[PDB]
Each structure stands twice: as structure tokens, then as C-alpha cells.
Design a protein around this nucleic acid. Structure first.
Length: 1287
RNA sequence: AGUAG
């Protein structure tokens, strides 16, 4: 039942009024939005901005710090061990104790060295003992720490400790300051380059010889490992029970020392690890001006650095600095090979590695912002027209504090000026000149991704994300005051626009414009009304609201306005349980809207933690607000699925294929000739062309008026027999017009716990009458109505197309539009005269003299007027194209973060390769390894070479093994316990997963276990080998102990909270277990009943994996804590929680005593037996003989109760064909896999991988490759060599 | 003093 609501009646708007308004609009000179790119223009912009800069910032004489860790090497570096650490610390402290301190930090390190050298023998044993062998002592209360205290610290050291406990810019217009910095970063970079004192066949001659053999001798390659060791030692002395003590470590035969001070643990947010690095002055990361002091010892100088405080983000970023720099250099290597057709020289790759390492070591936010703006500037100076004046003026909205900033500046100033004179792409980071723009843009993008996400000041960004919303809400209120509420809400009409012409502003919309846009979109929709209606009804508006995973998910949500006033922070599942508890029924989406219609919409904002400067916000809304948004979004997603110009409606892999196809039709059009029918039969010849506008929308959601959608929905065709659903959608849009937006508790506390209520914080607190929430109108909040706003933009673009077509019927232009929310691409196909324009100018003059004055806008550069009118018509719908981040170029496009050179894709796969090093699922060794390898395979699919991917895979595997302890020689190492080699142990048991990218991309992510099982089977069955039987016993241990690992996998619960959450004690554990046993169908389908659903959700609240997920503050807390948890008991065995070593011991015990039964063997032999274009890949053959879904059939088999059967039939596309499907399904599993699912306890294990066939793989092939999987595999085979043909 | 601004 759909409720009854009042809709909107048409106002009878005719396109002819808009066409006449456009004729009057285009008859005058219009100021273009973009400035032509000329060398003199860019040079003068830089000069004027340099001159202006110094008068806006206080002058700075002292360059600031940019090196997070300062250290130097003169000999090769061997990895640190415990004995090496002991000997090196002894020697280094003996060295330091002979120095003469002069600064407070020097005195502090002197005292620490004295304390370490005056430790007892028992103290040293307990200091270097393992966890299981450590015995506390008066001084060494923890392993790897000691205990200083007052009376063991000089006054000059207590002064430094109390100082710890308790914007000026550099002259960039100066040549003394701008050359003193280039001579500092060019010796750090010139010291990091000094040499210190089937796929494998191709990798050994190309990548291993020209990249990994050249860099393996540099100072950077060894300082990377030294800093890895230093960061590991810092991570160890950061956990709870340790961070509050002192520590002292030594590296490189005592040449480097690390004095770790007491500091807050990094488990609690907002804490820093404090350390000092005393080293031997030499080549490397040494900035002598930012060292605390330099102490001489006759001949050798020792550099004592400042007390560095590093948070967990930067600390974990410095631990993978070597891997990050190496991956970036390996990507630059491949890009150079593809650009110049030959391998780089030694010096080039060495300098590239040094630059990447320096970037990865200096994890500052100022440099991150500079590199964020550079990737916008570079596209703005290699294009015909752009907004480079604004981008450059923004580049100077920075104080340049460190030498590394005034060096990257000095480089950008030269690069951008050189690029504007050659429109031959000079390199930003080497002395080479590229042949393609993609090489340079990818080179700078890689340097942008060397900085981590979330380097901003935490509270600064918490304020920034609120000020934008408050400012635009105030702007909307001011517009309501000027023109009244009725005009701003219902929108103005054309006759008012003509009389004012200032009504065409943002947050204001024109009724006639939206009605005509809806009619233009109807011109497409009405041709497929049945399809649109069926797609709308396919959204299942009658199904219960809380039986959908998105409505019970783990994502954040808002609750109630607590007594404090703030809006509760909760989870979606918590609110679902709360609603069901106090309800009698499971309400449909529409019936839950009737009970929550009068409850105002509420919202809160949280940080998104982006890599870009000026982090953006994310909105968390209450349950009524979510129901409204789901109604609107279901309606508009169903409608927009059938509009090709809407790109959100694509799955995510189809966006690139669609934009490529659009560009192909554009190019096909351009390969033609236009003929304008001059009087009589004479024809004027015209050459077709194309111009690409990479439009970006300014303040998409903030500067908007959601009311424009209510009219838009009214006129928008859907094909349904009545308007009940349309009226409901209009009503939902009405209910989201006004929102109560709440300040975060963090920001409210900060403002309250303060004394300087300065301006810009007094007009911010006036938005909230009670100081907790304020009313926002018009704005629909970021990300809530994406598919509605994008569809509206598409409609307005189509309206512009129609208006231009009516304006110039004689001409033959070609418009292509792509919209993806605050991102668009416009291809304008215009005509130009051939040879001199003797006839074209005459025709234009005749038309202008005939009364068609608007032809004044097509005399020359049609595309200029095309874009002017398109922009104006878009503004009439309250859409503003960004004059800064929009680029116009006839031979280059940028869309969806992907670069196009007409019809050639270029995707930054570096982001995927570097993301595999961090942000792991953290569900255990097997899951994390399979996730890192999956992310490397994805990079391979996005265009990474089979050799750049093979290096990233090696790095990821090594890092995962080191982070879980399974690499050779550590705790959890299988060889210590198991009797088989590291290469023969199953991966779930710490086995060596070291597998080629070429087979991880085709066979799968978990075939190493399957290959091992096949090898063991063959060996045992052909020779009766005892070791093979041992391997089979390990496999059986994993199978009983049971990313999908069919042969089983250790079950981990890494996180367990101290506090239980709301509505978790409704049903006791015994009752939940009994309910799970009785109702087996509810393991594969969500109950469609209040009682069953409530019990199901309470049970889901008591799932270890869900418990771990709900207690997780970013992946940083995982990669941070795991170093300790590998010792702790985080695995499941015998029904309790034990260590992974205990699991290894149990596996060894069972395998050693394992015997080959007949069923085990039966099951084992049942188990073992050019143009860079984008295409699709398909690894699964057609097995779709099932009409219903897999959950429906699996639940149907176990369906016995009437309620269970009813819940199964509701969750089925074809409830009348379940039984047949099941039978077919059985055959389909017994004819391909040989497993009988009818047997109990068999189908439960097989099911979790029957959930497949949806992996829509998109691969960036070289163009000649067909879409077949075999063709793509052969292309990967042929691409194993970088600079050779290996057919 | 560092991060940050």
C-alpha cells in the first residue's frame, strides 16, 4: 500500500521562451571563463605572485624542519638483531660517553647513555630477554626498556624534559634564499645516490638488472632498511606498559643511536612517540641546520638531532618508506620504458629513487598540499584554455617554511613555465624530456601518493568541515531574505529572470528550466517506458526495511538528541534493533516512511581523512532521514540506470568502458566533413573538430537547492500507471528540505574549552541557536542524493543541446556529455572554415544582417560560445562549472581520475600498488596475504607491468610475513614447530606464499595450498612418502579446525572490546545457540519477521568478526598492534583462545600421528581432480542455469518451518522455481566439482564459494587484445618484457 | 623541541 500525497501540477513551459532568451543572450559579447595558456602569461603570473607573497607573510630567516628522521651511513647495512643490538649499544654508548655535551638534548642523551652503561648483568638479561623469559627488575621493568628518574638527570636535561612537557614564511622572491635551499636538497639528494662501501627470466634481465641492481648499492637503499629498523624499535616502545619508560637502541656497529624518551602510548589517539637520533656525521639524510648540535671527538663528528615527536600515522608511514619509494621508482621505470622505448640510465633511476625516498621520509602536510595543487596546475598549463591564474594564485597561498618547500617551489616554477611555452614535456624530477603528457602527469601523481592520508591538524579540519556547511546555509538564508521564501523554495520563472538577469545564481533555480530539462530527459525515457517502470518496481518497495543488509549494516548512523543536546553516534544495526524492539512489525520502506514522516531530518559531520588539502566531510543521518534518502535514491537510481550519460549508475568497472565508447563516437564524428547549404545549391565546406572540457562543479551539494528536484520528479517520466510512487518521492524530497545539522562533540568541546572566541567563530556559533544544532535548508548534504543530482545535471546538459540545436539549425555540431556528480566531461564537436574564411565570414555577416543576431557568437571559435551557453543553462539549474579546476584542450581529457589522450586510457595504478603495503583486513595471516596479493592483481589489471607487479607482490609478501612473524626466523615461524619446509607448509599455518603474479591473476589467490595438496597427494600415492603424509595430516588438521579457504584456516579474533554495546544482552548465549541450531535456514537469508529478525540481529551482535569490526579505529591500530599480538593468544583452538604457536604445535601433533583413511583419500582425489584500451575479463564459465539467487536456494534446502519457508519465498526472484533450481544446482555442483551437496555438513562448506560470478574484472590491455580471458592472459604473457617483443 | 597552524 502506497500512501496518498499531493503532487505538483505543470506550469506549461515551452522551449521557445528559452530559445528566445538564448538568442538575446548570445547576441552580445560574453566574457569567457578561461584564460589562454601562454608562456608569458604563466611567467607574469608567477612573477606578480612572487612579488605579492612577501607583503602578506611575516619574513622568516630560519628554515624549518622537514626531515622526520635524520641519519647517515658510510658502509653497507646489515639487518639488526638482538646480539648485534647489544654489542652496538655497548660500543655506541662507550663512544658517546667521551663527548662533551653542550645543549640540553646532548646532556639528556649523555645521561641516558650513562644509565644504560651502568645497568646490571641481570638488568641486561631482562632487557634483551623475550617475553616468555622476561623477569622484572628494579630498573628493567619491561623488556627493551630501562628506568631513569630525577637524581639521575642533570638540570640541563630536566630543563629539556620540562620544555617538552609544557605563520612566518621564507623569502621565495630572493635568489639568496632560493639558491641556499636548492644547494641543500641537491646534496641530500646527491648523497642518497652515492654507492655505499618464465616471468623470472624476463625479470632477471630487465628489472633485476637495470632497477634492482642499480639501486641496491645506493645510500638510500640502506638508509631505508636502517629507518625500517629504527621505526620497528620505535613501534615496540610505544605500546601500553612500555611507552612510559626510557629506551636506548643502536644500529650499524654503533654508528647510529636511538634514544627513546617517555611518551604517551600510540594506542590512545593524539599521542606522539618522542625520540632522538645520535649518529655519525656522514652522507645521507642530514640537514645540519636542523640538528640539535654537532659534537666533535677529535676527528669524527657526531650529529645530535632534535627531539622528534612522531604520531602513529607518520610512524607507520616511515616504516614502509623504503617499500613506498621502491614501488614509486619501479613505476617511474616502467613509465620511462613505455615513453622513450628504452630503459633509463643508471643516474636517472638513482636520482628518481633518491627523490622518492626523500619525499617518503618527509611526511609533512605542507608538501602534501603543494603536491596536491601541482597535479591540478600541470593539467592547467598543458591545455589550450584553463584557469591557471587562479590555480597559481592559490599555489602562493602558502608559507614556505622549510628548504624542501622552497626547492619543490623552485622546481614547479620552472616546470610550469617551460610547459606553457611548448604547447616535449620536461620532467619534474629528472633531466629527461618526455614525449607524452601521460608520463609527466603520472610522474607527479606518483609523488602525490607518497604522502599518507590524514596528515592534517585534527582539530583544524574538524572546524573546516563545519564552516563550509554553515557558510552555505547562511548564504541560502540570505537569499531567502532577499527574494523571499517562496521564490527561493519554488524557484523563479523565466519572465523574472529576463527582468532581473541576476536570478541566474547558485542556490537559485528556474522553474521553466527544470520543467524543460525534465521534458528533454523524457524524450529519451518515453522510448523505454516499460524498462524504466520495471526497473523502478524491481527495487521491491514492499519488502521489509530492516531485512536489507544496507539497513542493518555496520556503518555509522545517528540516534537521538541526547539530554546533553548532541546527536547520538551509533551503528545502523543498533538502530534497527532499537526500532524492532519497540515495534510490533517489520515495516516496508514506504510504510516506515508514514510512521517517520513528521520526524525532522537530522545529520552530523565527520572527517573523511583524505590525502588532499582541506579534507572533506561525511554526513551521518538518523533513521527517518535514511528512509527518505533510500526512497529518493531507489527511485532515481532505477530511473537513471537507463540514461547512458549518467555514470554513477554504472557498477564501477563499466564507467571506463562507457567513457571510452563515448570518446570513440566523438572521434568517429570528427572524421567527417560538414556542408552548410548556402543560397541556391552552393555549399560551404567546413572541417569538423573536437574540444574536450574537463568540467568540475563548484560546491555541488553546498551551493544547491534540493527543491529543484521536486519539480524535476513531477515531470520526469517513469511509466507507472499512477503517480502514487512519484508523489511519495516528491513528499520525501520535501521532508529532506530542512535538516538539523549538529556540531561534533569534539568541536563543541574545543570551542567551549577555550577563551579566544575570535571572529569567524562567533558567526559560526550563531548558526546553532542552542549551540548544538542549526537548521540547514536547500543543501541536501554530500553523498546523499548523488544519483539524483547527476541525473539532473544530465537533463540540463540535454536541454542545452536542444537549445543550441534550435538556435543554429543550419550548423551540424556534436555534443557528448558525461556526468558523475561533481565531475563532468563535455565533448564539443564544432566546425571551422577550410582555408581562408572568405565564405564563412560572408555567410555569418549575411545571417547577422538578416536579423539572426546570435550568429555573432559563431564567427570564430564556435566551441567558446557552445561552452558559454552550456554553462549558463547549467547555472539556470543551480549548477556552477568550476572556473579553476576546469580544463579545455583539443587532445587531452581527464575524467574519473583517469587521463585520456583522445581514446587512450591512463589510470594511476600506483595508488593500488602502494595501498597493498597498508590497510590490510587484519583477519589473520591467510586473509591479509590474500588481500595484499589481491590488491597487487588489481594493479596488474589496471595497467601495471607483469614485472612492476611482481616486485610489489614480493614486497607485500615480505611485509606480511614480517608483520605476522612467519618470515624465516621469528615467533610463529612454521619451520620451528612443523617438520616440513617453509615452502611445504600450508599458507594458513604460516606457509610460504611466494607465488608469481602471472598465476595469482589467472588461477586465483589461494592455489598455493591447492598446489601443495596436489603435490602431497601425488607423492604419497606414488611413493608412500612419510613427509607427504605429514603434509596431508596438516591439511586434515586445518580441515577439522574449519577470503574462502576451502581446506580451512585458523580463526582469529584480534580485537575484543572491554565494554559490551547496547541491545547485546536481550537473549542469552544458550538461547542463541539453540536458535541457530534449530533455524538453520537463517544462516543464508535474513528473517522477514520481527521476532526472528530481532533474534538474528542480536545473534549477529555476538559474532567475533562483527565484534572486531565494530571496534576498529582505522587500519593504523591493526598494523600498529600486530607486532605485539603475534605473541598474544588471538587464535581459536579446542573451543578456546590460544596463540598461533599453540595451533602450530597442535597441527604438528596431529600430523605426526595422522593415518591415511579411505574417506580422507577419496575426498583428496575428489579435490585435486599502442592504444591503451580497456576490456573485460571472465574467468568463470556459464553456470547460470539458476533463476533465483544462491542464498535463496541454500536457505530453501534447509527450509522446514512455515515461517522459514515464507521467508525463503520472499527472498527469491522466482519463488515458483526454487525446487527445480535446487535439483539443477545439485547437478551443477556434482558435474563440475564432484561434491554432493545433499549430504549434511557438506553444503555448508561448499556454499561460501558458490557466491561468485560477480567479479566484473576490467583490464587495461594494449588494444589488440580481445575481451576473452585467454586473449588477456596471452597479452600478459607478451608483456613480460618491457622493451622487447616476445610473441 | 617536534607535529600542526
Amino acid at each position: 500500500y502506497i500512501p496518498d500525497y499531493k503532487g505538483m501540477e505543470p506550469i506549461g513551459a515551452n522551449i521557445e521562451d528559452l530559445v528566445d532568451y538564448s538568442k538575446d543572450w548570445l547576441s552580445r559579447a560574453r566574457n569567457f571563463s578561461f584564460f589562454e595558456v601562454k608562456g608569458t602569461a604563466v611567467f607574469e603570473c608567477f612573477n606578480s605572485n612572487e612579488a605579492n607573497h612577501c607583503q602578506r607573510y611575516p619574513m622568516s630567516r630560519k628554515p624549518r624542519n622537514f626531515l622526520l628522521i635524520q641519519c647517515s651511513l658510510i658502509t653497507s647495512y646489515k639487518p639488526a638483531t638482538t646480539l648485534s643490538d647489544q654489542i652496538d649499544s655497548r660500543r655506541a654508548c662507550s663512544y658517546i660517553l667521551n663527548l662533551i655535551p653542550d645543549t640540553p638534548a646532548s646532556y639528556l642523551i649523555h645521561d641516558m647513555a650513562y644509565r644504560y652503561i651502568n645497568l646490571t648483568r641481570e638488568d641486561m638479561i631482562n632487557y634483551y630477554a623475550p617475553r616468555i623469559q622476561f623477569k622484572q627488575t628494579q630498573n628493567v621493568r619491561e623488556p627493551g626498556t630501562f628506568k631513569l628518574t630525577s637524581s639521575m638527570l642533570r638540570a640541563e636535561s630536566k630543563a629539556m624534559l620540562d620544555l617538552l612537557n609544557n605563520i612566518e614564511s621564507l623569502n621565495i622572491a630572493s635568489h639568496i634564499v632560493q639558491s641556499e635551499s636548492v644547494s641543500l636538497i641537491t646534496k641530500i639528494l646527491s648523497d642518497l645516490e652515492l654507492n655505499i662501501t618464465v616471468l623470472d627470466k624476463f625479470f632477471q634481465n630487465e628489472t633485476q638488472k637495470y632497477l634492482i641492481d642499480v639501486l641496491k648499492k645506493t645510500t638510500a637503499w640502506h638508509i631505508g632498511h636502517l629507518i625500517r629498523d629504527i621505526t620497528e624499535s620505535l613501534i615496540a616502545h610505544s605500546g601500553l606498559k612500555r611507552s612510559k619508560y626510557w629506551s636506548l637502541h643502536s644500529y650499524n656497529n654503533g654508528n647510529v643511536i636511538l634514544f627513546i624518551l617517555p611518551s604517551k602510548s600510540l594506542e590512545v589517539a593524539g599521542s606522539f612517540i618522542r625520540f632522538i637520533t645520535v649518529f655519525r656525521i656522514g652522507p645521507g639524510l642530514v640537514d645540519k641546520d636542523n640538528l640539535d648540535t654537532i659534537l666533535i671527538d677529535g676527528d669524527s663528528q657526531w650529529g645530535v638531532s632534535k627531539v622528534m615527536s612522531i604520531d602513529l600515522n607518520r610512524l607507520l608511514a616511515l616504516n614502509i618508506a623504503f617499500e613506498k619509494a621502491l614501488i614509486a621508482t619501479a613505476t617511474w621505470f616502467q613509465y620511462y620504458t613505455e615513453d622513450q622505448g628504452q630503459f633509463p640510465l643508471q643516474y636517472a633511476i638513482r636520482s628518481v629513487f633518491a627523490n622518492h625516498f626523500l619525499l617518503a621520509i618527509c611526511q609533512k602536510m605542507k608538501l602534501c598540499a603543494i603536491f596536491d595543487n601541482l597535479r591540478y596546475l600541470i593539467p592547467a598549463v598543458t591545455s589550450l584554455y584553463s584557469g591557471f591564474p587562479s590555480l597559481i594564485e592559490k599555489l602562493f597561498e602558502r608559507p614556505f617554511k622549510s628548504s624542501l618547500e622552497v626547492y619543490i617551489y623552485y622546481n614547479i616554477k620552472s616546470l610550469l613555465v617551460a610547459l606553457a611555452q611548448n604547447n616535449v614535456y620536461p620532467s619534474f624530477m629528472s633531466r629527461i624530456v618526455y614525449k607524452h603528457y601521460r608520463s609527466l602527469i603520472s610522474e607527479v601523481t606518483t609523488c602525490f601518493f607518497l604522502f599518507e592520508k590524514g596528515l592534517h591538524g585534527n582539530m583544524n579540519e574538524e572546524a573546516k568541515i563545519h564552516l563550509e556547511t554553515v557558510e552555505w546555509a547562511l548564504k541560502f538564508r540570505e537569499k531567502e531574505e532577499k527574494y523571499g521564501e517562496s521564490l527561493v523554495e519554488n524557484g523563479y520563472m523565466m519572465w523574472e529572470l529576463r527582468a532581473n538577469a541576476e536570478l541566474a545564481e547558485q542556490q537559485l533555480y528556474c522553474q521553466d528550466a527544470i520543467e524543460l530539462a525534465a521534458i528533454e530527459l523524457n524524450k529519451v525515457l518515453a522510448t523505454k517506458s516499460s524498462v524504466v517502470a520495471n526497473s523502478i518496481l524491481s527495487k521491491n518497495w514492499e519488502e521489509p526495511y530492516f531485512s536489507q543488509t544496507r539497513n542493518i549494516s555496520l556503518k555509522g548512523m545517528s540516534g537521538q538528541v541526547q539530554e546533553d543536546g548532541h546527536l547520538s553516534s551509533s551503528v545502523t544495526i543498533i538502530e534497527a534493533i532499537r526500532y524492532l524492539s519497540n515495534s510490533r512489525h517489520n515495516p516496508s520502506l514506504l510504510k516506515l516512511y508514514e510512521e517517520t514522516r513528521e520526524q525532522k531530518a537530522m545529520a552530523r559531520i565527520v572527517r573523511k581523512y583524505q590525502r588532499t588539502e582541506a579534507d572533506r566531510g561525511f554526513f551521518i543521518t538518523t533513521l527517518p532521514t535514511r528512509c527518505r534518502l533510500e526512497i529518493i535514491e531507489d527511485y532515481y537510481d532505477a530511473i537513471a540506470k537507463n540514461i547512458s550519460e549518467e555514470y554513477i549508475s554504472y557498477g564501477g568497472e563499466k564507467k571506463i568502458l562507457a567513457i571510452q565508447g563515448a570518446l570513440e563516437k566523438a572521434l568517429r564524428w570528427a572524421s567527417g566533413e560538414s556542408f552548410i547549404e548556402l543560397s541556391n545549391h552552393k555549399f560551404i565546406r567546413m572541417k569538423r573538430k573536437l574540444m574536450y572540457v574537463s568540467a568540475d562543479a563548484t560546491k555541488w551539494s553546498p551551493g544547491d537547492n534540493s527543491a529543484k528536484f521536486r519539480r524535476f520528479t513531477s515531470m520526469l517520466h517513469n511509466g507507472l500507471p499512477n503517480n502514487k510512487l512519484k508523489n511519495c518521492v516528491i513528499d520525501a524530497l520535501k521532508q529532506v528540505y530542512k535538516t538539523d545539522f549538529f556540531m561534533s562533540r569534539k568541536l563543541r568541546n574545543y570551542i567551549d574549552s577555550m577563551e579566544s572566541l575570535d571572529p569567524h567563530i562567533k558567526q559560526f556559533l550563531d548558526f546553532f541557536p542552542d549551540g548544538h544544532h542549526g537548521e540547514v535548508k536547500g543543501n541536501w548534504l554530500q553523498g546523499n542524493l548523488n544519483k539524483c543530482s547527476s541525473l539532473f545535471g544530465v537533463a540540463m546538459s540535454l536541454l542545452f543541446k536542444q537549445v543550441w540545436t534550435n538556435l543554429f539549425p543550419e550548423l551540424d555540431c556534436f555534443f557528448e556529455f558525461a556526468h558523475h556528480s561533481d565531475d563532468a566531461l563535455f565533448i564539443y564537436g564544432y566546425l571551422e572554415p577550410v582555408d581562408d574564411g572568405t565564405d564563412w565570414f560572408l555567410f555569418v555577416s549575411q545571417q547577422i544582417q538578416a536579423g539572426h543576431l546570435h550568429w555573432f557568437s559563431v564567427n570564430t571559435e564556435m566551441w567558446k560560445s557552445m561552452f558559454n551557453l552550456h554553462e549558463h543553462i547549467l547555472l539556470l539549474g543551480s549548477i556552477k562549472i568550476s572556473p579553476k579546476k576546469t580544463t579545455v584542450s583539443p587532445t587531452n581529457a581527464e575524467f574519473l581520475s583517469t587521463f585520456f589522450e583522445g581514446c587512450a586510457v591512463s589510470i594511476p595504478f600506483v595508488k593500488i600498488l602502494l595501498g597493498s603495503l597498508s590497510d590490510l583486513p587484519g583477519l589473520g595471516y591467510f586473509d591479509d596475504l590474500a588481500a595484499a596479493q589481491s590488491r597487487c592483481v588489481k594493479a596488474l589489471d589496471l595497467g601495471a607491468s607483469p614485472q612492476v607487479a611482481q616486485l610489489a607482490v614480493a614486497l607485500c609478501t615480505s611485509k606480511v610475513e614480517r608483520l605476522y612473524g612467519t618470515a624465516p626466523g621469528m615467533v610463529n615461524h612454521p619451520a620451528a614447530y612443523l617438520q616440513v619446509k617453509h615452502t611445504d607448509t600450508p599458507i594458513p599455518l604460516g606457509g610460504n606464499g611466494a607465488m608469481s603474479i602471472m598465476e595469482l591473476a589467472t588461477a586465483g589467490i589461494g592455489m598455493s595450498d591447492k598446489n601443495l595438496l596436489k603435490r602431497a597427494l601425488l607423492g604419497y600415492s606414488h611413493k608412500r612418502q612419510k613427509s607427504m603424509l605429514y603434509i596431508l595430516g596438516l591439511f586434515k588438521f586445518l580441515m577439522k579446525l574449519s577470503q574462502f579457504s576451502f581446506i580451512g584456516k585458523v580463526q582469529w579474533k584480534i580485537f575484543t572490546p572491554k565494554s559490551e554495546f547496547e541491545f547485546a544482552d536481550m537473549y542469552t548465549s544458550k538461547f542463541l545457540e539453540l536458535w541457530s541450531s534449530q533455524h538453520v535456514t537463517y544462516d543464508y537469508i535474513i528473517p522477514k519477521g520481527r521476532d526472528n529478525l530481532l533474534i538474528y540481529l542480536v545473534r549477529k551482535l555476538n559474532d567475533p568478526s562483527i565484534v572486531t569490526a565494530m571496534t576498529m579505529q582505522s587500519p593504523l591500530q591493526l598494523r600498529f598492534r600486530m607486532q605485539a599480538k603475534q605473541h598474544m593468544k588471538v587464535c581459536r583452538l579446542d573451543g578456546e583462545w590460544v596463540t598461533f604457536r599453540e595451533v602450530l604445535a597442535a597441527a604438528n601433533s596431529f600430523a605426526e600421528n595422522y593415518s591415511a583413511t579411505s574417506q580422507d583419500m577419496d575426498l583428496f582425489q575428489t579435490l585435486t581432480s599502442r592504444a591503451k584500451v580497456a576490456r573485460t575479463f571472465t574467468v568463470r564459465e556459464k553456470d547460470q542455469i539458476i533463476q533465483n539467487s544462491i542464498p535463496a536456494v541454500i536457505g530453501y534446502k534447509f527450509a522446514v518451518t512455515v515461517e522459514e519457508m515464507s521467508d525463503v519465498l520472499d527472498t527469491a526472484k522466482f519463488p515458483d522455481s526454487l525446487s527445480v533450481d535446487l535439483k539443477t544446482m545439485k547437478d551443477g555442483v556434482y558435474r563440475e566439482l564432484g561434491l554432493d551437496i545433499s549430504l549434511p555438513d557438506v553444503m555448508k562448506r561448499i556454499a561460501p564459494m558458490l557466491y561468485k560470478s560477480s567479479k566484473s574484472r576490467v583490464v587495461i590491455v594494449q588494444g589488440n587484445v580481445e575481451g576473452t580471458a585467454e586473449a588477456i592472459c596471452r597479452y600478459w604473457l607478451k608483456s613480460m618484457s618491457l622493451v622487447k617483443t616476445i610473441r
